[PDB]
Amino acid sequence: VKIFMVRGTAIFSASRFPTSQKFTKYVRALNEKQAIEYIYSQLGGKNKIKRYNIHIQEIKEVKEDEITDKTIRDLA
Template structure:
């Protein structure tokens, strides 16, 4: 069984494509088994929350981070858990 790791995904996305297109940078902390799964989560997250198409999301960097480097409080709390009941 693989261990779940925390990845930091950086990139840019095109928001408001139809009315007033705005390209914005993002940094998202993701719990995943590997880099491919982390990238897929970012695509689905921005697609469902902001209706952004995959071709409008450019991922520039994916790297594994240690628990001390995590900026997102909810991800950090989940990463520190030993087990979920």
């Protein structure tokens, strides 16, 4: 299923915080194209953030046996 790792920049009045409660998320998806939609899907409406100020910095794949979160883990 190839779990993905997303870390990108979105802004209203400098909402950059490359850490984990006001800036970025995790994703489970097949490929980049499906994955890249999801961040648009959520951050686009959940906080009124246009894809203008969306700037994906790092996108990659994590291995299935090491993620700091168990909630994303057990759902398999």
